[PDB]
């Protein structure tokens, strides 16, 4: 095992544990100290403001396993910092005949038992567990633990009838999943069930969502409502808020619906952020955000998704979500998408970035695996005085059309996303900062320009603004993590409404993904204007790339080259000549970003461990 | 529900929880402060001279889950006081993977774990887990934990690879069982193997058994021995050590095998007590003590059993035990014995006395359940100058016979147990004890007469050497537990050699038990005596009956007279005449015996629970 990044590539695998640790590593973003995460778990805004994160976790081993939460916190969600107790950086694990299994993604109850936080999580124990085998009820069951240090402990309830599990039964028989219960406050839905109340008996001002599905008969998110205000024991099912059918699809702006939901959750939504409003803000959308599986043949089966939805009471007391248009949250390599309220009138989400070593050839040399995306201020975004001109507006797929009086211009309403302003502040702020002169890409273009000034490392932020004609076929954007021999492509084609990365090039290690990644991009064309534009931003961070257009659509995946010179960048031109031209303005380099985890030496490793011979004979982990 | 114990019982199952708490309770012996109880476990005299005692125990239930060791210690065996930690009386119970499903029984390696006193136990997980059932490999592995604070807390390994568990390979295929290791050195064991050591390797100065057995193909015992002295993680298995076949019976005196073994142990006895000797005491005999289970059609399918066994060396470097001779260890409702050593050459004995409500008819107004047996000196019974014409003496059933050079004496040789002395001291000198005139049974002899001293209460001990003729067919006894209406009778009958406790009146409760109990005794005839002897100890504790015979053989059993006056005892008479004499003198009661729990409260309830609806989903524990 050589690590020499100025020669070609050695075998890897014959490399011992961890030492690649700091190679590909993310130094700007959440990320476990090592060993293995995947979700996103028990966000909350404490009550000093600070931001408390935990995430599914599984310490020194490289695939998942008794799984925990782990758990940091941060004052700006940039800079963040270790809890830091009897097991380590872990605040939960499983230590109960009903969680022993896994302590899987639970949500967070602010005013709890006893007035103290609270987590409603999915406790699991033996049995059969997934959508595609024969899971049975008990399995899986929700189960509360609070805490009174504000997160550096948690304190489960008691097994046993009138406690732990507090949610067992399974409100339809077949399911193929139910977990990932989801908390919420909604003034909406308490409004719009008020004239119910007296058929379940249900009152409280909590909700919780449990993400499954029936199977052979698609994906469901069944609908809880606390049965007694202040009491946290009883939750009553009301029915299924989400159904849809098995492997269904709303078209190929939306994913697919697949067999199966996951970390399902409910929002509420205006211009501004979230909205707390009763159903008396015309400007608010109800939003649902969940995962699928099963309905896709790559990205480990696994769709993130949303859909903005209309809430209709049903006569027994429920309340079925029906979708009004539905669209991709991340169209890369994250999944499991949490969104809490953050003060100010803010939804923030928050997803995990899985590796592209789906084989785990590598993983035990990482000697970790995972990490988040950015946290991201969900809003609904209103695009003014679009042109009907525009291609595919009326399809209506992953966004609304409401026609002027004159049918001369239309309002698009969709999903905003974009990166939490305190992120991109303090990225600013510590990167040395170059402001680019613009480019017009002609026939005089090359392939690939080099940015004037170049990155110095694998931790950066490239913004510009890409203006094309209307009936344009060009296509231009950015190559990053780049040598002559080693390099990344991301390019938008406006004629198919595509962007994509191309990553056969990205590295010259074979064992690492090398797929194209794809998103669908509407550019809503103004009127009166005689071009469209694109709004990229790209975040380079280790291994990461995540990209933004538009706060709109979002698209994170992985690079992972070998040499150490593989850190340039530059603009990209396909197709542009003297009559089809693409105008690059806005264009911004930030070079460093942030160090995330000031705390933490740049090697957290503590070895690898193996579960030995019985975790083959127990059939629940892999054991390393 | 009335409690008037000067009527008749009306229906004592609308009684509460643990209304009847104190109504049968021992008072003078080991039990659990409240709930279920069942096998001793991790027995071993501490550093300071005392005994720790722990027990499989479910507090607030009476059926078994679980299953955790409860504790307690004591300065003579007699008088207990509990250990109290974050878990009551718990120092031991599931917390992990591998012993989730519970903490069953184990044994003391006395300097373990960095000179710590350590337990070996048999931890649980998932899974069939029966004698009659398909069970698997990994369901029962065993592990270590020690204590660095004498029993008040122990630390369990860590789960992996080279730590917990540390035997989990199944020896052989399709075992009924693999549990209760039990851990002890052996001078005897470690001479006969140490010209074997080159072919196992294996040279540490502690063995340690497993018990089970092969499905279709009966019990087994498996040795292993520690692979390298002072290191506890590696232990070799050198082979089976005890084979019996599929529901063998050695005969009348022997019980019977059953298909599989439970909380065997391994010790080495000579006339004194325990023989630490290699081999070259003529007079020590190596015993084996087992349970055994399904050949049995009452007394919960479970014979306590043992065996003396000759050592064969294989040539593997294995033992095979050869059984000499084999007896029962207790003939009532016993089970689970577990042997340990004590200063002074000792070997003590002590196990499980179950209740008699096996339909859990008043188990909940009990609010617990289970007790242990008195404590036992263990030694080898020598017997010298037995007259040849005693019946059966060449069966050589439970007991060896050497002839004298001349052929007109015997010696006869057996396993014996009697109560500690430090036990029969206390009772003894705590008690209002009566010396009761000896009483010769002929024909004026009444079927029951009450002894010229009676019981206060039902907590007594009774003494009395009963002298028969050679060929008598009268029987004699003692009656206990009595009023009227209400009574125990133990009978002795020298024809048929049987001890009996007839208990179709010892209560007016129909639901307990009533089946006739049965021991065999043989009366060793000495040359030139006219008659023959038996002596008789009775204790009365609460509900137990617990009766000894000549240092030899034990019955332990359970009656629940309703009525407050059923606390009278006597003697009994059956075909006693003019010329078919019983001689009875020796004869004393004990009134009172000792306050063995003197810290406790008389009602040490703390409620009874229920585990909910998920118990029947995880399918492992009652629930209640
Ligand atoms: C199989 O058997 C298992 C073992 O028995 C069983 O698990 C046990 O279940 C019981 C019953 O459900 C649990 O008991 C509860 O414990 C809660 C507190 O839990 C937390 O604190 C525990 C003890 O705290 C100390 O001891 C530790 C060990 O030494 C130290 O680390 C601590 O520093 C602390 O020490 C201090 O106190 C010591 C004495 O206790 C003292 O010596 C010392 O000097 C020092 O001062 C921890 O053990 C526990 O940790 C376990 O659980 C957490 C998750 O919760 C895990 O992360 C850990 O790994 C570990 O497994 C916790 O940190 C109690 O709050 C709770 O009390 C109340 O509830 C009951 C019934 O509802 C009431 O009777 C009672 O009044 C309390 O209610 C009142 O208070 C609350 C608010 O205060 C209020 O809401 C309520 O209305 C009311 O007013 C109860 O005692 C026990 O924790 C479990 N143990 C373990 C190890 O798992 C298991 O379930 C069984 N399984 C089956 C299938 O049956
Ligand atoms: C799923 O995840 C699970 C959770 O992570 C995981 O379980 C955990 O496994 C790890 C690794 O095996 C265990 O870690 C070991 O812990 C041993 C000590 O255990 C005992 O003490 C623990 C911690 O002690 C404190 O914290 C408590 C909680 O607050 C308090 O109650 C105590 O008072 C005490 O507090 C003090 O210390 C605090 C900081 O620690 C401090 O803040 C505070 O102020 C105060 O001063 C207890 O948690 C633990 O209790 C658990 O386990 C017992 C049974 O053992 C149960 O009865 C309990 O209910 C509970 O579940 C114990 O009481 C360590 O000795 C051990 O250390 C060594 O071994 C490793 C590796 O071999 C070495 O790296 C290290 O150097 C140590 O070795 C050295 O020392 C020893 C002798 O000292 C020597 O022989 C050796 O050669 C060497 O020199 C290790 O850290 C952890 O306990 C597990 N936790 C739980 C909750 O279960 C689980 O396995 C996972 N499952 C799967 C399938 O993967
Ligand atoms: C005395 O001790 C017992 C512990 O043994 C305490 O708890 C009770 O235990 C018994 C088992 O011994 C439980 O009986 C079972 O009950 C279920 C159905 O229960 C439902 O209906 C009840 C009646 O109104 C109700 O109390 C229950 O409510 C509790 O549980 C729910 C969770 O499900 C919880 O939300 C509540 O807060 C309560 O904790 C519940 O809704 C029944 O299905 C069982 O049937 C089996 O057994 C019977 C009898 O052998 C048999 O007929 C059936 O065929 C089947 O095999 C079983 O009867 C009882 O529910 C427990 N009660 C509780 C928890 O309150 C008890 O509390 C102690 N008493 C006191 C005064 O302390
Ligand atoms: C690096 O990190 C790893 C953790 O990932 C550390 O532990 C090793 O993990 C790997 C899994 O990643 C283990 O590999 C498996 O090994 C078994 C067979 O193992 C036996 O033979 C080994 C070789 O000499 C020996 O080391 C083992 O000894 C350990 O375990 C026993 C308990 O069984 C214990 O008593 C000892 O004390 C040791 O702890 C053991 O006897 C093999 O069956 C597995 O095969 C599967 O996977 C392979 C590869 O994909 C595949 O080919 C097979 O078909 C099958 O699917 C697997 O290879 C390895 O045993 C672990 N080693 C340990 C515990 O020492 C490792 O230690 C870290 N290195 C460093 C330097 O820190
Ligand atoms: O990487 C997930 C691994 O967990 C396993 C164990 O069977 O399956 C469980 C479950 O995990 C994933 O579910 C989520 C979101 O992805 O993660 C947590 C559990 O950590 C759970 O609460 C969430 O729903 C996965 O998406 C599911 O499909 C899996 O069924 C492994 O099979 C799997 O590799
Ligand atoms: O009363 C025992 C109850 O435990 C259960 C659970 O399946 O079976 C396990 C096992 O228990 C008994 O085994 C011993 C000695 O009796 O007790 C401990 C477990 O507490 C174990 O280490 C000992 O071997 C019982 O004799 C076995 O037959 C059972 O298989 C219940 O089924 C059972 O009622
Ligand atoms: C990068 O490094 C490689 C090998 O070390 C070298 O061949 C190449 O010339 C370097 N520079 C660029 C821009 O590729
Ligand atoms: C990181 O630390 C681990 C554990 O100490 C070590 O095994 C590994 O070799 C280190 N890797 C690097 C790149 O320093
Ligand atoms: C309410 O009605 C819906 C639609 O039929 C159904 O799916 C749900 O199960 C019902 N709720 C109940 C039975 O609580
Ligand atoms: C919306 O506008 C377009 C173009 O003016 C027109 O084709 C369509 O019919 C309009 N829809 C409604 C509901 O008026
Ligand atoms: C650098 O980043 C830190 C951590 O997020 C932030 O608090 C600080 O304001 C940043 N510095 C700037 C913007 O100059
Ligand atoms: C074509 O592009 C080059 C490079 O941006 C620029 O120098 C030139 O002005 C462009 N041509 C026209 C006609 O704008
Ligand atoms: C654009 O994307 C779609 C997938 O939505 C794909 O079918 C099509 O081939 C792509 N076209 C081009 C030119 O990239
Ligand atoms: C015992 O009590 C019962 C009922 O209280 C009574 O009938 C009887 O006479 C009493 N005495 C005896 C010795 O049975
Ligand atoms: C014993 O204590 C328990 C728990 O407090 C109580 O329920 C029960 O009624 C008491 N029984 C007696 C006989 O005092
Ligand atoms: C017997 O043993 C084998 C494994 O050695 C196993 O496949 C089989 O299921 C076991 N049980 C029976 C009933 O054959
Ligand atoms: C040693 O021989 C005995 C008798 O054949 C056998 O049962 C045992 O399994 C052998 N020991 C081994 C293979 O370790
Ligand atoms: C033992 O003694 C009896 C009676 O003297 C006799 O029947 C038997 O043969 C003797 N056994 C031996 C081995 O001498
Ligand atoms: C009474 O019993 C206690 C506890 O076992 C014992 O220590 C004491 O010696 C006894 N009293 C006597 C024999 O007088
Ligand atoms: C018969 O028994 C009674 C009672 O023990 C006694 O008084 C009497 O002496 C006995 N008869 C003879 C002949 O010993
Ligand atoms: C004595 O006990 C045996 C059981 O070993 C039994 O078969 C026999 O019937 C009993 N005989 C009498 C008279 O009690």
């Not at 204007?529 to 990229?536: D, H, Q, Y």
């Not at 030496?601 to 503590?606: E, G, K, L, V, Y």
Request: with cysteine; net charge negative; aromatic share 12%.
């Amino acid at each position: 095992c050589s690590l020499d990044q100025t020669v070609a590539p050695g075998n890897l695998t014959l490399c011992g544990n961890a030492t690649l640790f700091t190679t590909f590593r993310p130094k700007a973003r959440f990320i476990a100290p090592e060993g293995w995460m995947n979700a996103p778990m028990g966000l909350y805004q404490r009550a000093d403001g600070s931001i408390h994160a935990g995430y599914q976790s599984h310490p020194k081993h490289i695939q998942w396993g008794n799984i925990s939460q782990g758990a940091a916190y941060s004052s700006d969600f940039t800079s963040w910092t270790d809890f830091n107790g009897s097991e380590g950086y872990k605040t939960i694990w499983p230590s109960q005949i009903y969680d022993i299994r896994g302590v899987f993604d639970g949500s967070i109850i602010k005013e709890g038992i006893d007035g103290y936080p609270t987590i409603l999580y999915t406790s699991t124990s033996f049995g059969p567990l997934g959508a595609t085998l024969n899971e049975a009820e008990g399995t899986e069951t929700q189960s509360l633990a609070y805490t009174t240090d504000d997160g550096a402990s948690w304190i489960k309830l008691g097994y046993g009838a009138g406690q732990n599990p507090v949610i067992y039964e399974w409100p339809e028989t077949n399911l193929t999943g139910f977990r990932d219960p989801y908390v919420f406050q909604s003034p909406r839905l308490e409004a719009l069930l008020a004239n119910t109340t007296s058929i379940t008996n249900a009152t409280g001002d909590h909700f919780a969502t449990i993400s499954g599905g029936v199977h052979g008969d698609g994906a469901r998110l069944f609908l809880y409502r606390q049965h007694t205000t202040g009491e946290f024991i009883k939750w009553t099912y009301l029915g299924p808020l989400v159904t849809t059918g098995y492997k269904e699809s709303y078209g190929e702006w939306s994913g697919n619906y697949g067999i199966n939901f996951e970390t399902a959750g409910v929002t509420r939504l205006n211009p501004a952020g979230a909205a707390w409003d009763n159903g008396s803000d015309t400007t608010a959308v109800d939003f649902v955000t969940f995962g699928t599986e099963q309905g896709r043949a790559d990205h480990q089966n696994h769709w993130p998704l949303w859909a903005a939805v209309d809430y209709e009471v049903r006569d027994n007391g429920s309340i079925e979500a029906v979708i009004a248009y539905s669209g991709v949250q991340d169209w890369g390599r994250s999944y499991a998408y949490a969104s809490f309220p953050v003060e100010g009138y803010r939804q923030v989400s928050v997803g995990w970035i899985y590796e592209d070593d789906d084989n785990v050839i590598l993983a035990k040399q990482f000697g970790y695996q995972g990490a988040f995306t950015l946290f991201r201020d969900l809003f609904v975004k209103v695009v003014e005085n679009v042109s009907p001109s525009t291609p595919g507006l009326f399809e209506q797929a992953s966004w609304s059309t409401k026609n002027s009086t004159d049918g001369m211009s239309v309002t698009v309403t969709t999903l905003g996303q974009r990166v939490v302003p305190e992120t991109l502040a303090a990225y600013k702020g510590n990167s040395t900062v170059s402001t680019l002169a613009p480019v017009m890409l002609n026939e005089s273009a090359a392939a690939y320009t080099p940015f004037s000034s170049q990155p110095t490392d694998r931790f950066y932020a490239l913004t510009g603004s890409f203006e094309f004609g209307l009936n344009t076929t060009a296509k231009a954007g950015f190559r990053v993590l780049a040598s002559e021999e080693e390099y990344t492509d991301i390019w938008f084609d406006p004629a198919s409404e595509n962007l994509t990365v191309v990553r056969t090039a990205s590295s010259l290690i074979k064992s690492f993904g090398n797929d194209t990644e794809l998103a669908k991009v509407k550019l809503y064309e103004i009127v009166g204007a005689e071009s469209k534009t694109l709004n990229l931003t790209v975040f380079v961070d280790g291994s990461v790339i995540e990209i933004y257009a538009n706060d709109e659509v979002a698209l994170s995946t992985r690079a992972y080259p070998w040499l150490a010179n593989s850190t340039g960048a530059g603009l990209l031109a396909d197709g542009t000549t003297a009559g089809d031209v693409v105008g690059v303005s806005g264009l911004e380099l930030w070079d460093g970003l942030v160090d995330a985890w000031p705390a933490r030496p740049a090697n957290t490793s503590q070895g690898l461990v193996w579960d030995g011979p019985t975790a083959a004979m127990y059939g629940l982990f892999a054991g390393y």
